[PDB]
């Protein structure tokens, strides 16, 4: 039994330093912010503003000259200049207290550089996989973190880098420092821990900068996840329209009313009455038929794929329910 994963969005603010760089970024190209350029201009200018705002929402020290001037010192301000670092400082402190180990994912390898200095400044043992790490080295980092009685506590990874199907079930908590445009890259990052072999409840903390760009980024990726799940559940609707008729289906069509046909010594239902007609009788037919039509349409148009799908055992015709 594998326990379903808990996913919690941690909406976070920005330090005064972040606000400064956030304004500085918007001011550098404020005419693009106001949407004053022509519709012909490339996406490049807007995409650049987007990435710099993500760097600002992650940590100000991603920009050169941001961190206070020389001499450069690792300090407490490495934590108190970024809204996520403050939330992370206490979140990790509480994670280590309850005996939980944590994987931390990020989009940017320069941010894991900042987290490396934080881990030593706080005394945390850790591993790290960037995607610039070779095949054999990241194997040792996996096994080191997975070792029975391991010394490590935090695992630093970039969202895409691990590969596919790696096992980090020795950790129980996943911290997404920042999210991906592709919701499947992040879900693959959560499933590093939430997969067969995990015995404890997997909890995923997705850091989100509230009232900023990352809040609107969250909704665009949430829709993409929802739109994805809709394609997936209809993946068998392709076959159903394509599928030809069963031996079970053809048999049911022919047998429909076959007994009453064999019983009829005269004529079938409608023609039993007259067979010549009164416009009252024809207007009675159309009214009765329109009633049956509306019932049929409303009955089927509310169905989904799970009601119209034919299992493959349908064409595995064995015997008759009761004989004909």
């Amino acid at each position: 039994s594998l326990l379903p994963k808990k996913e919690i969005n941690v909406y976070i603010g920005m330090s005064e330093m972040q606000v400064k760089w956030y304004q500085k970024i918007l001011e550098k190209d404020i005419d693009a912010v106001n949407g004053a350029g022509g519709k012909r201009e490339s996406k490049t200018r807007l995409l650049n503003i987007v990435m710099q705002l993500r760097k600002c929402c992650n940590h100000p020290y991603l920009f050169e000259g941001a961190e206070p001037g020389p001499p450069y010192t690792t300090d407490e301000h490495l934590i108190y200049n970024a809204g996520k670092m403050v939330v992370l400082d206490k979140l990790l402190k509480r994670i280590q207290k309850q005996g939980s180990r944590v994987l931390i994912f990020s989009q940017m390898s320069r941010l894991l550089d900042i987290l490396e200095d934080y881990c030593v400044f706080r005394g945390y043992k850790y591993c790290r996989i960037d995607g610039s790490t070779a095949h054999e080295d990241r194997i040792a980092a996996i096994d080191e973190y997975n070792k029975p009685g391991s010394d490590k506590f935090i695992f630093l990874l970039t969202t895409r880098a691990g590969g596919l199907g790696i096992n980090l079930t020795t950790a129980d908590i996943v911290i997404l420092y920042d999210s991906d445009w592709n919701p499947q890259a992040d879900l693959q990052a959560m499933d590093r821990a939430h997969r067969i072999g995990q015995t404890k409840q997997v909890v995923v903390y997705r850091f989100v900068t509230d009232n900023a760009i990352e809040e609107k980024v969250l909704e665009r990726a949430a829709q993409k996840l929802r739109l994805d799940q809709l394609v997936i559940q209809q993946g068998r609707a392709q076959v159903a329209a394509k599928a030809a008729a069963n031996k079970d289906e053809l048999l049911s069509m022919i047998q429909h009313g076959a007994e009453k046909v064999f019983q009829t010594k005269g004529a079938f239902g409608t023609m039993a009455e007259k067979g010549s007609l009164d416009d009252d009788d024809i207007d009675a037919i159309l009214q009765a038929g329109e009633t049956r039509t509306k019932e049929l349409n409303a009955r089927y148009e509310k169905l989904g794929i799970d009601d119209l799908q034919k299992f493959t055992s349908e064409s595995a015709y064995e015997w008759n329910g009761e004989d004909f």
Binding site: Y61, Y72, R110, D113, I114, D117
Partner: peptide
């Protein structure tokens, strides 16, 4: 020194 450099 520090990794963020």
């Amino acid at each position: 020194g520090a990794k963020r450099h």
